Paper text:
We have described herein the reactions and the structure of Pgp3, a Csd protein of C. jejuni. This enzyme turns over the cell-wall peptidoglycan by both the d,d-endopeptidase and d,d-carboxypeptidase activities, as documented by mass spectrometric characterization of the requisite reactions with synthetic cell-wall fragments.
By using the H247A mutant variant, we successfully solved two structures of Pgp3 in complex with a pentapeptide (1, Ac-l-Ala1-γ-d-Glu2-mDAP3-d-Ala4−d-Ala5) and with a crosslinked muramyl tetra-tri peptide (2, NAM-l-Ala1-γ-d-Glu2-mDAP3-d-Ala4−mDAP3-γ-d-Glu2-l-Ala1-NAM). The importance of these two complexes is that the scissile bond in the peptide substrate was seen bound within the active site. The tetra-tri peptide fragment (mDAP3-d-Ala4-mDAP3) mainly interacted with Pgp3 via its two terminal mDAP moieties. Tyr129, Arg195, and Tyr215 of Pgp3 contributed to the binding by forming several hydrogen-bonding networks. The hydroxyls of Tyr129 and Tyr215 were bound to O7 and O8 atoms of mDAP3 (from the donor strand) via hydrogen bonds (3.0 Å and 2.5 Å, respectively). The NH1 atom of Arg195 formed a salt bridge with mDAP3 (from the donor strand). The O5 and N1 atoms of the other mDAP3 moiety (from the acceptor strand) formed hydrogen bonds with the backbone nitrogen atoms of Val243 and Ser244. Importantly, the N1 and N4 atoms of the two mDAP of the tetra-tri peptide are responsible for linkage with the Glu2-Ala1-NAM moiety, which are solvent-exposed through the channels A and B, respectively.
Author numbering: 20 to 274
Write the structure that this text describes.
């Protein structure tokens, strides 16, 4: 198989006598195929920055092992050469501490795995606008990726209502350094949607949220380039192309 870096794919496997799916020593969770009672699914994601060239997963069955080869593709992302090498910025200690604390908190959430569906059918887009900055726009130095846009930006004047892309449980709902006013929702199966730079947060941590339910108002918090809605998806432990993921997810769980 082939998969572009920074995207997810849904792996389909036989359910009968399946024991475990592994990437080296890392276990990949499985969930039911909603349409084919003899299949299960798993989400495999490749990181945008510095992915392996190839991946081999082993599905262990009671009587066999089944290998799965995945070749990484570079894709056709927009990319611009950085010019200033000076990358190690030097923030004040008070900012370094906040950054480090919010990163620990987020990683604890994104590493967690809810082993049931909290979603309800297909994902919807969080507002009926248009993309002004695509996922995966990269800045490169040393023929390597120095940074990239880890979500997609929708056009939104400050104060535009933002709605949950799918049902789930709010896990983050506060102001964070790079994301500004942030909402993160657990949809189950390690799938999280992200709503950043809001001007107003209308949900609390732990709250159960319905698809299409108001979660806040867009803004420009934490954002230098003015008002927009940054929408992200984390799945398989990685930030992935959100509209690509939604398209792949909806093809399976639509009906
Ligand atoms: Zn963005």
């Amino acid at each position: 198989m082939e998969l572009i870096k920074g995207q997810a794919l849904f792996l389909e496997l036989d359910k009968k006598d399946f024991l475990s799916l592994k990437n080296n020593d890392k276990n990949i969770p499985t969930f039911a195929h909603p349409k084919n009672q003899e299949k299960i699914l798993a989400i495999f994601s490749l990181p945008y920055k510095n992915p392996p060239q190839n991946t081999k997963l082993i599905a262990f069955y009671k009587d066999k092992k089944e290998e799965i080869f995945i070749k990484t593709l570079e894709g056709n992302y927009k990319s611009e050469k950085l010019q200033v090498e000076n990358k190690k910025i030097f923030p004040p200690k008070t900012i370094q501490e906040r950054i480090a604390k919010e990163l620990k908190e987020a990683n604890a959430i994104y590493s967690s795995y809810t082993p049931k569906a909290l979603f309800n059918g297909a994902f919807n887009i969080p507002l009926n606008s248009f993309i002004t900055s695509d996922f995966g726009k990269a800045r490169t130095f040393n023929e390597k990726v120095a940074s990239y846009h880890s979500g997609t930006d929708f056009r939104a004047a400050t104060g535009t209502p933002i709605y949950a892309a799918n049902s789930g449980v709010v896990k983050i709902a506060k102001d964070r350094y790079f994301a500004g006013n942030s909402v993160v929702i657990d949809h189950g199966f390690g799938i999280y949607s992200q709503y950043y730079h809001l001007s107003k947060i209308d949900v609390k941590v732990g709250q159960k949220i319905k698809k299409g339910e108001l979660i806040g108002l867009s803004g420009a918090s934490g954002r230098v380039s003015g008002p927009a809605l940054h929408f992200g998806i984390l799945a398989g432990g990685k930030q992935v192309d959100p509209l690509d993921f939604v398209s792949k997810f909806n093809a399976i769980f639509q009906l």
